[PDB]
Structure 1
């Protein structure tokens, strides 16, 4: 599973003590169903890049937890290497078209199911498939 850090949807927050999430409650006492994702930083040559695990929760994460509650399947939430959704971008040699972002990690086999704020349009549905929104 790959996703991007969306602030109303996918909260990504560093771990408290040792690879673990602080058990936070909502206004009703419902525990926030958090998952141990893997979050890399934005600039890998600009800083010492560690690729530490991190906490993911929020809207789409709880939607994915409901989906995994429905059908018996496990999951491994990771994040995108660079903060882009993915566009039909032309590479420099021979002017060839390629993909980047979450779609670039999807078509390269690194991802299996994008549960993320992904906008449905024409150019994406030609190459990948879409569920109902």
Structure 2
């Protein structure tokens, strides 16, 4: 028995912060900038971060923009949910197996493992052929994150348009940014360099730009522009090459698709989405 929605998510600060449960299996009482309590959910994701390894599922503490938004969509539409993290830690791309299959959250949604995707999931043509996206809950773009000192014009710096070994840049494997370079001819000389260095996770690449084991990171501006504000040693370069929005993922059969978009609009209109942004996304300076 159930009508309890399987919610797949990913770890992506400031959208979804994932932390351990306490010794009783409960979540730490944290309070916002305002002083209001941080809303927290339990998310049943794995522990072994290694690829091709046994996934041992363990309850964890999930909170962030996308959790507040999920709690909102839940209250509003009146539904119950269970949150779990994407078993392979990926967003979703379609790869050749003749037959093709989706990895990450996209794979999870389409396979039945999840009934909805509440994460910073970029809306694109590829995914939209297979899944239904909500009206966007965020509009951002792509930018380049570098260590303070690294000088780059933007996406058209000679160190990026003509690659080498002195300058190593990459993105997250099996994401929309991967698909973006993988489908564009003008960026063919970029993707062939980037596929040699792509990271399993955003956290890992942002770490590698801190370690100087990476020079530039092409990723989502809502995340990158945030990491720079949190970590003053890192900086974003150039304006925004390509603009994209985030949407709630569902299957094409899902009878919630209408009511999800009606809530996202209700929320934009009544300043609750600007409220979420003011709470999570836009804070700190360097």
1:40 matched residue in structure 2:
46
Can you give the 5+ residue segments of structure 2 that lack an aligned partner in the other structure? 1-6, 137-286
Q: Normalising by the residue count of structure 2, what TM-score does the alignment of the two structures yield?
A: 0.43
1:99 Cα deviation from its structure 2 partner: 1.0
The aligned length equals: 130
Distance 1:29 1:43, change over 3 A: closer
Q: Secondary structure at the match of 1:63?
A: helix
Distance 1:21 1:6, change over 3 A: same
Q: In 2, Cα distance between the equivalents of 1:45 and 1:85?
A: 15
**CA deviation map 1:88-123 (0-9, x unaligned):** 1000xxx21111110111111111111111111101
**Does structure 1 conserve the Cα–Cα contact (< 8 Å) formed by 2:55 and 2:87?**
no
Q: Which has the higher helix share?
A: 2
* CA positional deviation for 1:45: 7.8
Moved >6 Å (runs of 4+): 45-48
Contact in 2 for aligned 1:42/1:82 (Cα 8 Å): no
Unaligned runs of 5+ in 1: none
Q: Deviations over 1:33-74 (max 9, x none)?
A: 001111212446888854210100011001101111112110
| 1:14-46 alpha-carbon deviations (Å, 9 max, x no partner) | 012211001111122210000111121244688
Q: What RMSD, in angstroms, separates the aligned Cα atoms of the two structures?
A: 1.8
Cα gap change, 1:45 to 1:89, in 2 (>3 Å): closer
Looking at CA atoms only, which structure, 1 or 2, has the larger radius of gyration?
Answer: 2
Q: Secondary structure at the match of 2:119?
A: strand
